[PDB]
Design a binder for this molecule. Sequence first.
Ligand code: 1VU
Ligand code: ATP
Ligand code: ATP
Ligand code: BTN
Ligand code: MG
Ligand code: MG
Lengths: 133, 592, 482, 70
Amino acid sequence: VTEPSAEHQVDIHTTAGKLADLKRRTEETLHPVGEAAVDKVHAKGKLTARERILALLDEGSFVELDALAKHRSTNFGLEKNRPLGDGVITGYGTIDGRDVCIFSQDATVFGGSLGEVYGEKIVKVQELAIKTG
Amino acid sequence: SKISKVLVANRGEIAVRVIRAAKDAGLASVAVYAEPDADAPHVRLADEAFALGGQTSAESYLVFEKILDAAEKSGANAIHPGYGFLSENADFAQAVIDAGLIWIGPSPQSIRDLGDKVTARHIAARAKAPLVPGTPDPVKDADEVVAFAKEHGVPVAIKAAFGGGGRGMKVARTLEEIPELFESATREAIAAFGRGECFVERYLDKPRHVEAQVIADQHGNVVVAGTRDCSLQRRFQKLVEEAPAPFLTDAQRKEIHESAKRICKEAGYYGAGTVEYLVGQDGLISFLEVNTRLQVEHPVTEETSGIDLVRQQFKIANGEPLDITEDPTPRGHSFEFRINGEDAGRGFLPAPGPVTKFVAPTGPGVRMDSGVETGSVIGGQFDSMLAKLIVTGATREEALERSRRALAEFTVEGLATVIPFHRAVVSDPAFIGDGEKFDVHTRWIETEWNNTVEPFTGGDPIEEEDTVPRQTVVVEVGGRRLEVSLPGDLAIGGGGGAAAPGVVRKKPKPRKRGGGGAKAASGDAVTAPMQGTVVKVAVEEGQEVSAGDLVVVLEAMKMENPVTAHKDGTITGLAVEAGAAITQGTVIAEIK
Amino acid sequence: SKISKVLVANRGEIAVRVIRAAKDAGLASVAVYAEPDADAPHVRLADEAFALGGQTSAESYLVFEKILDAAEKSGANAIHPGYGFLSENADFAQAVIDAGLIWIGPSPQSIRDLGDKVTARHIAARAKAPLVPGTPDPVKDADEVVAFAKEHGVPVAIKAAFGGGGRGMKVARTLEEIPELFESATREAIAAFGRGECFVERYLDKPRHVEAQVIADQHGNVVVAGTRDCSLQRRFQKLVEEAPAPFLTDAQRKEIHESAKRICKEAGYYGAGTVEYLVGQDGLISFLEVNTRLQVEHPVTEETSGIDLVRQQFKIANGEPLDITEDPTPRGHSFEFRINGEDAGRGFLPAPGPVTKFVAPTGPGVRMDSGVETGSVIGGQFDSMLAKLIVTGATREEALERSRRALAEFTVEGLATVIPFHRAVVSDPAFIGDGEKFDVHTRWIETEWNNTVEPFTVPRQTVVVEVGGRRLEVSLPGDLAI
Amino acid sequence: DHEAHIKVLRGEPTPEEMAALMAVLASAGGGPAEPVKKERNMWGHPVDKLRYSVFSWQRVTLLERTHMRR
Ligand SMILES: CCC(=O)SCCNC(=O)CCNC(=O)[C@H](O)C(C)(C)COP(=O)(O)OP(=O)(O)OC[C@H]1O[C@@H](n2cnc3c(N)ncnc32)[C@H](O)[C@@H]1OP(=O)(O)O
Ligand SMILES: Nc1ncnc2c1ncn2[C@@H]1O[C@H](COP(=O)(O)OP(=O)(O)OP(=O)(O)O)[C@@H](O)[C@H]1O
Ligand SMILES: Nc1ncnc2c1ncn2[C@@H]1O[C@H](COP(=O)(O)OP(=O)(O)OP(=O)(O)O)[C@@H](O)[C@H]1O
Ligand SMILES: *C(=O)CCCC[C@@H]1SC[C@@H]2NC(=O)N[C@@H]21
Ligand SMILES: [Mg+2]
Ligand SMILES: [Mg+2]
């Protein structure tokens, strides 16, 4: 069988297919709750959490950690909604050539409220910063 | 029926060309792409795109069922095969016709007859074309070859009856080489093409390659759109072409034109096709082949004659009679250069890589038909061609001057190409000529050209000084614009601050594993030297082999590379099978 | 007495074209760039590049002293002005000749005579060229124009005897308009052309603008490279052009190929140039102008006739007789589209901005002459033309089909362009003639065309040095770290 | 001969422009030409002002390391 370009996904059982899968997931992390929420933020006149990090740090210096994290709660039907990153963007970078560790909370994910994986990511960057000085 | 939607069953610059022709004619276009081509220009250019799947041609473009399924799903009522792949597959043509789609090409019977060399020889003889002396029928033994050599004088060329791609011919200089050459030719033909039949003819010493472009309709009309000279060849495949054929007497020119028409009419040929001849140093013409596909060279004839050959081919497929009644008069002179992803300084050996930059020339007399753009990646599975640069002028001298300009402008980065060779040849006196003749021939590049091109190295730092960072600045000194590069540790005058408390500069080591002296330091594994496809496996597990014995044959860039045993021992743990794609460093087998 | 090194005293597309011509001919090329053009393609393409300074044309490209100093410093022995700027400035041509350089173009006398449209009309009369009725001398006052209107019949056209750009035209429809129109014409001619002389003639309603490219020798030989049509215009300036001129009768192609030769020979013209005519609905050809420089639309003539007009200019300046002995026969049809940085959805208004993406089409019958590339920034200091797309084919219909393809492929982002207008017009039936005539004219775009285009949405450091007997300026980036 | 040289990638200056350019560049160059070895002075180093737990591994990896780096 042949497929139209829209529906085709490279065979996941190949290295190229696995790279394509990683690209798809990375692209999804850009708008974890849909492009409508990003548009709402911009219309409100604010920057997204990612835009804030990219604006603060030097260009091309951001390395993100736990980008694909998801929450593991099952209470009150939370399991039906598991946005990537769980509402906080964490990583490290440079400001004026000097290394820093950074986190930025995302108000579009559960109102920006802190969950377990959220807090775990923040703890990870805090430990990294203390460790690296 | 009339073409309404064309499926281009090809890839690259030819796919782009046919898609553009369909757009010009107002027809819908459907492209089919393998997984490596998911982002090629043609996939985006075509009105529709379909994913054949598979990582190699044997499972992507050479599958009749996949191409026909794409046609069925897209609703395309015509199929155009480009060139290569299935363009000369009579079985595929008949399959398309049976499926009930307009096959944009010659009939399957014409394909068969003109693809069978001996049948082609019969057709040419019946058409009274100029032929070189040779055996009318396949030779049965080296004894017959020896008798023919005695009769007609050495050298003598032995050619496979179904050979193509330049691999199907070998030469004997003396009567003693005939037996070994015969047996090896038969053994290689049975393997490369299935059929081991071969025949023998006279070999020309320094021949030119001249071909005629023929546009023939289904109503019996045939028109010779022009002649081309393709005397510059790496091994037996063209690199640079001209239109019209330079320095040919009117007698030779009219002989070619008439022989081409006669051959096509005797073969019943229709659609765009080409007739290839050879012209020896004596001036004698010798019919060589009939290509039943659209030549890659066609743009030079398009420029000189002012005809759209792809659209003519659409019309012929539609069944309309030719709207051209006489051979067009050439205007100007056009050169064509193939931009192959090969390193001229390394014996023209193709290698894959990314096109990190691609800036084509533009302006007077320049046409560029490319299948890649900046950001494209050349894998190891398909042909090395990236684009074709056509430069047209009022005369041959004007075309050469414009070609020098255009090749100076043309820029590619990320992988090697043949631009340095084109730049050198367009100024070599042997190619310029004396105004009445020139010294180029089919073997000129590989045996007479003074190859001054150094191997491609990209931006890799090789020497100790290459490791120092640099900043490039624009400086105006008395108006003059200068582009000055400054090292990061320049101690000019009293300037200092060089290096750091413990910084040492040293010659970097190449990203290669040692050398031959440690080919396998207690290493039993046989590792693939390059990415490609295992097209042959010459051993089986438990087989004893000696150093130099062939283990596998990997096809990369449509060229075969043999991987041989590095040590004496028993083949153990054979890990690959024919048709398996292989990455560099993969363990093929362990010799123990 | 032979060109060895050519300085191109221009910018952009024409600079690139002339530099390429010099490279083809084997000549060395010297480009000159103003401050905004430090990154222009011609700067990097030329063998040598010189900075003229200045932020605008009045400071950089229009200064005789700067251009001639660049030539002297570079050692260039010839100067090619392209088009615009000083290409038609007789004073600059005379200065170039006096400096001992080869002026690639017509003589200062020819330029001066044919730039005065009154003297141009006199030469046309002497050459017996077709002429639209009009005053043979500048009109003294609005009363004379009123008398002429009464004599011949409105509408009427008023034009400054000097200058150009298309804006010099004023139109009067009734006898009451003349006073104010003439007063405005006199004021504008004084203010923007430096000379208040104005003249009057009959106004054609819906004419077709037709030209004939002429290659004129220094030895008297004259050859008409071919006709051309530029009827599609806005603000009296061209946007799309064709070659050969379509749908002219043989009797019309003749008398044009001959009026051009007669007018050029009478004026003593040598070098490349063009003779612009007008063809009214009635079918009457009328002499309009003579451009004494290489014209923008030369590519279509080059494609159809096979002549390289810039190299022909080099050969004429060298003084060699023309190698072309008879008028070439066109081998096909060619369209030329100007890629101007203008928003067609906003009344063709200039829009300065960055060229974030510029993907030129390529393939059969497509040629591109561009002065920009991805990353270029377009300001208001200069004309808004970015490139020229030439599409050639065996017939007019094939050329139109190829144009529809090439325009679909051509992509530009970051600023507005007339690409949408080109895409629309190439498919508009008025421009796809029925087979023997077509409906466009010098005002079709603004008046009939259905405009459906949606609107688009550190200082350098300098050091002064003296080496021997010269004073030099070394300019460096402000943040040179060294 | 393995040292990084200044390169004029584009342009063909004459001796006068070359001399002017080199003079200006040499003048622009500066900084520490042939500096003396930077004098060690550990007096009042920040590491000595920190509170270390009596069993802190930083007493080895930060305090001793800083005092001994040489
Ligand atoms: C230490 C213990 C604590 O801190 S108890 C947590 C405090 N409770 C709060 O919600 C703080 C005050 N909250 C609010 O009233 C609003 O959410 C505030 C923060 C003012 C933001 O208002 P506004 O920007 O209009 O948003 P909204 O409330 O209309 O909708 C926000 C979406 O996110 C949700 N959300 C919000 N807060 C939480 C939370 N703490 N836990 C879980 N979900 C939360 C809202 O329900 C709403 O979700 P949805 O988009 O309607 O599906
Ligand atoms: N008799 C001959 N003497 C010298 N060279 C020859 C002779 N026959 C063939 N050649 C060389 O072979 C080249 C092409 O050979 P041939 O036509 O048999 O194969 P091909 O072009 O690869 O085939 P195809 O296009 O059908 O796959 C010619 O250009 C010429 O270089
Ligand atoms: N008599 C006329 N009737 C109608 N339109 C005219 C007439 N004379 C000139 N035009 C218009 O003027 C423009 C061309 O005039 P012309 O070239 O003489 O002017 P210009 O300002 O010097 O222009 P340029 O120097 O750019 O060619 C075209 O728009 C043409 O339609
Ligand atoms: C396959 O990927 C493309 C076909 C490339 C080989 C064909 S063979 C015949 C033509 N001659 C040539 O050099 N390339 C074409
Ligand atoms: Mg061949
Ligand atoms: Mg004009």
